[PDB]
Write a protein that binds this ligand. Structure first.
Ligand SMILES: [K+]
Ligand SMILES: [K+]
Ligand SMILES: [K+]
Ligand SMILES: [K+]
Ligand SMILES: [K+]
Ligand SMILES: [K+]
Ligand SMILES: [K+]
Ligand SMILES: [K+]
Ligand SMILES: [K+]
Ligand SMILES: [K+]
Ligand SMILES: [K+]
Ligand SMILES: [K+]
Ligand SMILES: [K+]
Ligand SMILES: [K+]
Ligand SMILES: [K+]
Ligand SMILES: [K+]
Ligand SMILES: [K+]
Ligand SMILES: [K+]
Ligand SMILES: [K+]
Ligand SMILES: [K+]
Ligand SMILES: [K+]
Ligand SMILES: [K+]
Ligand SMILES: [K+]
Ligand SMILES: [K+]
Ligand SMILES: [K+]
Ligand SMILES: [K+]
Ligand SMILES: [K+]
Ligand SMILES: [K+]
Ligand SMILES: [K+]
Ligand SMILES: [K+]
Ligand SMILES: [K+]
Ligand SMILES: [K+]
Ligand SMILES: [K+]
Ligand SMILES: [K+]
Ligand SMILES: [K+]
Ligand SMILES: [K+]
Ligand SMILES: [K+]
Ligand SMILES: [K+]
Ligand SMILES: [K+]
Ligand SMILES: [Mg+2]
Ligand SMILES: [Mg+2]
Ligand SMILES: [Mg+2]
Ligand SMILES: [Mg+2]
Ligand SMILES: [Mg+2]
Ligand SMILES: [Mg+2]
Ligand SMILES: [Mg+2]
Ligand SMILES: [Mg+2]
Ligand SMILES: [Mg+2]
Ligand SMILES: [Mg+2]
Ligand SMILES: [Mg+2]
Ligand SMILES: [Mg+2]
Lengths: 53, 85, 148, 204, 49
RNA sequence: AAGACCCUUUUGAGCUUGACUCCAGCCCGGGCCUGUGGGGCGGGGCCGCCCCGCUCACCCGGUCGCGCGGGGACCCGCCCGGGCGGGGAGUUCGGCUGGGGCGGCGCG
RNA sequence: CGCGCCGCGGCGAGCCCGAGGGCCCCGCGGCGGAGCGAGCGCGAGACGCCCCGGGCCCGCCGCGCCCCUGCGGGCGUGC
RNA sequence: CGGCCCGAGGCGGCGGGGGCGACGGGCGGAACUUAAGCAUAUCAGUACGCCCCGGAGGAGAAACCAACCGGGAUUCCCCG
């Protein structure tokens, strides 16, 4: 989720912020972009159970 | 140390000393094939060396061709019998 | 639980305990254990003597159960006897009826001599003995035996 | 006894004048033939029976010729880029042997048959010749015979492509057991994955 | 015959002493005592643990 | 227009070469491929070289195989060994310093 | 996920829902219990509310003296 | 002129070829990255490219381990 599209930074010199952008110029691949990935995606390897003697 | 030190090793039980473990007809097949083929060139060279009494040279040559000391000794013991004259 | 942790008491503080002059950057010292002989030598020498170099013979494959060797002291021999018969063995100390303890049955090989034994004769069967273990047992009137 | 013991004894020494003459004639003729050729009957009948040939309808034998020497990488202008450990071009060795490459070539030529086994028939400075035993699995004399109709099972397609013949097994290392062979089974990839897995148990 | 009446048989193993034999022959002999051959009872778990 | 000049970063890239460490390619030697004969030289008490016939391996021409040749056990190929090798590959090109550099060395 | 330290719960010379088998029942290792020595190997009681220090014991390195089964045992001295 | 040997064209019956974002088998095979630089090392016997089956596949009944008062084909799980 968030990483199926193609996006790369435009660099400095075009008067825009440096995040990755889709062809056309739309923001992507940031947690602060609409349609980007989570900063730290949830994962099923969280330890769900606990031990008791 | 490859064994565990304890006196009285083999004290409780009684071990089994199993039975430890030719073919003249195979010998006979060998005799016929030798009859119709002969020997190999390196074997002929070894025979000439043995006839000239250069035993250590024969061993060196056999080691160089065979790559194994026991097998080279067995080979020149085989060839001495046909090299004696 | 996320709701009892230090990190959330830092909301509204910009930097989160990492400093304004220094800051939080990726790897300001390098990754892992690198630098132990150059720019971390003070740490490595203060806390880890004998971390660098070589020492002694090497074995290309160790036999774990050849080198295994359990041991028991003589202050433990009388606790292998169950609790309900020690009183009797102690009362009727006998040269003709003496308790026999076999320690390989309990999984020990050598017998060392820490401690002391009660004043009562006893046979002890092991696979090897230490000098003062023998001394103390033969001093209380016991006998050391070798077992297969 | 029979005759194949004499034939085996005879083939166990090739330096002799008789066999030298016969080998010379065979290599001249194979040099005049093509690279993959059908054979009427096996050239070594005793070796063929040792490896599983039976003179029945459904068994065929082909002669495959392969070239000798080492390996050269496909790199344009002889340039490998990258790290210096990876720069070599010439002087390399193939991972499978020439026997296995022979079986693979004939399997690619004849994809509706089943490769069984193979054996050596000649060489010179430029070429080695093997013979490959192949079986047609839809012949009734093959299907109805319990000795060989294992290979009518469809899990026996392109065995030489999956490395399951004798020479392919030797390349994979399976002629060995014990110490020195504990990472080779069931395969190298399988042992690596098993040894490198993280197993996150519930009651961890 | 043993395989038929339900006994694992390992012709690759060799005994190392006579006590091995005595212990295992007691086990075989007792099992052959306790087997019946044809509301019957199906034993559970490992046989003679 | 997050200076392009200037400096710093244990951030690059194009180019060069007597930087460091290498690779193709080419040259050279023995061996196998690889037959069948004749000779000379030297050594040690069988060994090492060198030469030159033949044709049958192997190789090259001519021809619509229309009435024919040339080479030859050498060459090629393969294995191992030595040399040449910015044509090409990867990488490096200290520090302090009244900015850097030339200079100097309170760098032990 | 791994490492260090601190707090709390259970049990304690012991401790423990491995895997598996019949929110319940049964369930091996392992870790702790003895250390030191490159290794052959040898192997700890003597004191003390607690802490700190002193003394003495075990191993590694060295050396008097006596002896039995002996380049092995005993008994001592030293950093 | 027939046999055997080595080949050629045609005819009949039968089989092959292509397809899949997983699992499985066989080959070829990086660099970023880490080492606070960088050549061995690492990343990784991974990405990716080619070939090949199946419902699983591969492996498999010792030219094994051991050093014991010994076990006994293959696979998988716990443990170090
Ligand atoms: K993407
Ligand atoms: K920005
Ligand atoms: K910005
Ligand atoms: K979206
Ligand atoms: K902080
Ligand atoms: K700071
Ligand atoms: K850094
Ligand atoms: K770093
Ligand atoms: K690191
Ligand atoms: K270090
Ligand atoms: K050393
Ligand atoms: K070829
Ligand atoms: K490159
Ligand atoms: K590169
Ligand atoms: K690399
Ligand atoms: K093999
Ligand atoms: K192994
Ligand atoms: K700027
Ligand atoms: K600038
Ligand atoms: K600038
Ligand atoms: K400047
Ligand atoms: K600049
Ligand atoms: K940088
Ligand atoms: K740079
Ligand atoms: K550039
Ligand atoms: K450059
Ligand atoms: K450039
Ligand atoms: K160059
Ligand atoms: K450069
Ligand atoms: K537990
Ligand atoms: K020592
Ligand atoms: K690779
Ligand atoms: K890399
Ligand atoms: K680099
Ligand atoms: K690197
Ligand atoms: K590197
Ligand atoms: K290394
Ligand atoms: K490398
Ligand atoms: K590497
Ligand atoms: Mg941008
Ligand atoms: Mg989203
Ligand atoms: Mg504040
Ligand atoms: Mg900082
Ligand atoms: Mg330095
Ligand atoms: Mg700029
Ligand atoms: Mg710096
Ligand atoms: Mg650069
Ligand atoms: Mg500077
Ligand atoms: Mg680096
Ligand atoms: Mg590795
Ligand atoms: Mg299968």
């Amino acid at each position: 989720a968030g990483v199926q599209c193609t996006a790369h930074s435009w660099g400095p010199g075009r008067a825009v912020a440096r995040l990755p952008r889709k062809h056309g110029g739309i923001g992507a691949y940031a947690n602060f972009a609409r349609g980007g990935h989570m900063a730290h995606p949830t994962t099923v390897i969280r330890r769900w159970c606990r031990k008791v003697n | 140390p490859g064994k565990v030190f304890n006196l009285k090793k083999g004290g409780a039980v009684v071990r089994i000393v199993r039975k430890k473990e030719t073919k003249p007809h195979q010998e006979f097949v060998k005799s016929i094939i030798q009859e119709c083929t002969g020997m190999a060139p390196y074997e002929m060279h070894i025979i000439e060396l043995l006839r000239m009494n250069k035993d250590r040279h024969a061993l060196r040559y056999a080691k160089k061709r065979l790559g194994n000391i026991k097998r080279a000794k067995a080979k020149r013991d085989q060839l001495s019998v046909y090299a004696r004259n | 639980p996320t709701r009892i942790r230090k990190s959330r008491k830092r909301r509204g503080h910009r930097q989160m305990g990492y400093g304004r002059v220094g800051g939080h950057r990726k790897h300001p010292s390098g990754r892992g254990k690198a630098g132990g002989l150059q720019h971390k030598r003070t740490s490595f020498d203060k806390y880890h003597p004998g971390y660098f170099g070589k020492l002694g013979m090497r074995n290309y494959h160790v036999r774990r159960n050849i080198e295994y060797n359990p041991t028991i002291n003589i202050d433990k021999i009388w606790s292998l006897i169950p609790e309900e018969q020690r009183d009797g063995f102690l009362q009727r100390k006998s040269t003709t009826e003496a308790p026999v303890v076999d320690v390989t049955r309990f999984g020990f090989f050598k017998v060392l001599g820490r401690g002391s034994l009660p004043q009562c004769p006893i046979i002890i069967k092991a696979r090897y003995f230490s000098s003062d273990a023998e001394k103390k047992l033969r001093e209380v009137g016991g006998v050391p035996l070798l077992v297969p | 006894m029979g005759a194949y013991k004499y034939v085996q004894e005879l083939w166990r020494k090739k330096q002799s004048e008789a066999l030298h003459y016969l080998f010379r004639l065979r290599t001249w003729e194979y040099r005049q033939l093509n690279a993959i050729k059908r054979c009427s009957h096996p050239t070594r009948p005793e070796k063929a029976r040792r490896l599983g040939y039976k003179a029945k309808r459904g068994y065929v034998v082909y002669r495959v010729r392969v070239r000798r020497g080492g390996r050269k990488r496909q790199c344009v202008h002889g340039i490998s880029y990258g790290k210096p450990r990876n720069i070599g071009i010439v002087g390399l060795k193939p991972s499978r042997s020439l026997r296995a490459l022979a079986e693979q070539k004939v399997g690619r030529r004849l994809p509706s048959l089943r490769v069984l086994n193979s054996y050596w028939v000649a060489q010179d400075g430029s070429y080695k010749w093997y013979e490959v035993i192949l079986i047609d699995p839809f012949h009734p004399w093959i299907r109805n015979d319990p000795k060989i109709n294992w290979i009518c099972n469809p899990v026996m397609k392109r065995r030489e492509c999956r490395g399951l013949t004798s020479a392919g097994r030797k390349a994979r290392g399976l002629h060995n057991k014990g110490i020195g062979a504990m990472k080779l089974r069931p395969s190298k990839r399988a042992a690596w994955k098993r040894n490198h897995t993280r197993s996150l148990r519930r009651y961890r | 015959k043993a395989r038929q009446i339900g006994i694992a048989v390992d012709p690759r193993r060799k005994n190392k002493s006579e006590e091995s034999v005595a212990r295992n022959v007691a086990r075989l002999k007792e099992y052959l005592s306790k087997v019946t051959i044809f509301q019957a009872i199906q034993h559970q778990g490992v046989v003679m643990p």
